[PDB]
Symmetry: C6
Subunit: 101 residues, 6 copies
Amino acid sequence: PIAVGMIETLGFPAVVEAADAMVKAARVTLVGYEKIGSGRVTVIVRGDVSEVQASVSAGLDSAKRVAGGEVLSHHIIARPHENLEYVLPIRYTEAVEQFRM
Amino acid sequence: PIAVGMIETLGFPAVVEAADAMVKAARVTLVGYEKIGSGRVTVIVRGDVSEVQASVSAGLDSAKRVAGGEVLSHHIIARPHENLEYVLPIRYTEAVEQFRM
Amino acid sequence: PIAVGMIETLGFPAVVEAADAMVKAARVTLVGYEKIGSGRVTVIVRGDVSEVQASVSAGLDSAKRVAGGEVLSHHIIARPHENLEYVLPIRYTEAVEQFRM
Amino acid sequence: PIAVGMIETLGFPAVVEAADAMVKAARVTLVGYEKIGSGRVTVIVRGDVSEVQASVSAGLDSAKRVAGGEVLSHHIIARPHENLEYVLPIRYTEAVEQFRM
Amino acid sequence: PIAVGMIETLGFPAVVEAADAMVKAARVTLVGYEKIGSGRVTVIVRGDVSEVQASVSAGLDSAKRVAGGEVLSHHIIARPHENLEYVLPIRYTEAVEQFRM
Amino acid sequence: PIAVGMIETLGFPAVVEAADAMVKAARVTLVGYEKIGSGRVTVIVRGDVSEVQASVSAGLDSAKRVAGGEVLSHHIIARPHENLEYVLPIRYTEAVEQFRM
């Protein structure tokens, strides 16, 4: 029952700061980086919901301070249906298994 | 004769919530995630039409409450022509066979 | 010398409905789904010119009734040059031969 | 050294009409279809310069009559440097060799 | 080290003209064509800085004369750091070695 | 623990100049070039934080002087979490190892 947190920014430098602040703020794993066009990019973290809450809060705080930085949207899902794991890029991957809690 | 339900959002975090709420609300299978540019992303579910109708209703309800969320369009097709299955990314895939009802 | 009909929408769910209405309304084969960016997507049907004309008219009517539905452009070519078949994605493919008429 | 003709449209159905009108109007070969984002797509023809001029002129006339159709730009180069052949998608390919004049 | 020249236009027909004009005007090699979205495309030349200077001036002049033509930006770097050669698409490639000077 | 510097421009020629000025201004390695659409492109450097500061400052100064040049955003992270290395295109690669300090 692993939670998922997401921060979407306009521009790449701000999404890197969001990711960095998120994994430094709490026990979460950065598993994803998704581009959907219009300069909209999202970073996705997984972990226990309380950790994810703290991560996202810290990521939002730091991302908005980036020069030219813009946060567009953000969301947490405490208990994502496991169907999502097999369709959307929110899942752990072999390349980040070392960073799982 | 399996129905198809679709919710299109502006932004990725909102489309994840759309998918989550859809598959939790009724007996439907999330089979697809489609990017067409300009931040427009769609999630696609299959199931009996009445299930799909309930899922789409719940998905719209929750996606709109996502911070920075916006729903652009949505649609249900009760009985899609099977020609659509071989051209459009709405078909069941091997990766989600385990979630079929 | 088989005709080709095309409906371009802004948004994915309406293009799926466009495709559905087309192949249900008359004797045409859905052969293509083309993304050119910025939310612009086209579905492409082949068949006798009179069928194609019936399909497109229906597809336009149906797509516009989609919540958030929008049509950008549409066109029919009765006798497309065969040179187009080898450059533009309007040709029959193996995966839809079973739907040829 | 063979002339190159190009018509860029907003929307896909229009660019298909452009191509069709071009290869029907004179002795040219459709060799390329190029997407650069923003809904801008270009079709590219090769042939003798006076043929290319007649093809482009006809393509411009037909494409603009497409419902929802817009021509964005167009150009003819009578004698393109052969360096362009190896970098830009304007060259003949194996798939259209049967349509060389 | 070898200079690099760049012209970015809105629209594909205009970069083709920019490329053609550049390689005809001086001793430079066309090595690259780069799409970054929103219809922005750049053609890249390499050569002695004085040559590149002449190529770019000619490309700018000719590109702006293209029907629907628009130049968005352009730049010359006389002596690019070799690090750029291994990251950005400005380097000579096998396909254009025959055109080096 | 190696710092990361990022400059995002609107347009490609300007991002090339940014990279060039960056690696020439201090001891940093250009490791990445990232496109996220809508003409937004970012160049990424690694090095000691004081070096990255000097490079980014110099890249910003030079990029804004490019004809049609436009900087959208920029950021420095002195001590990026190692998790980001396996998700975001900010890491060293084989192709640039010879330029590591």
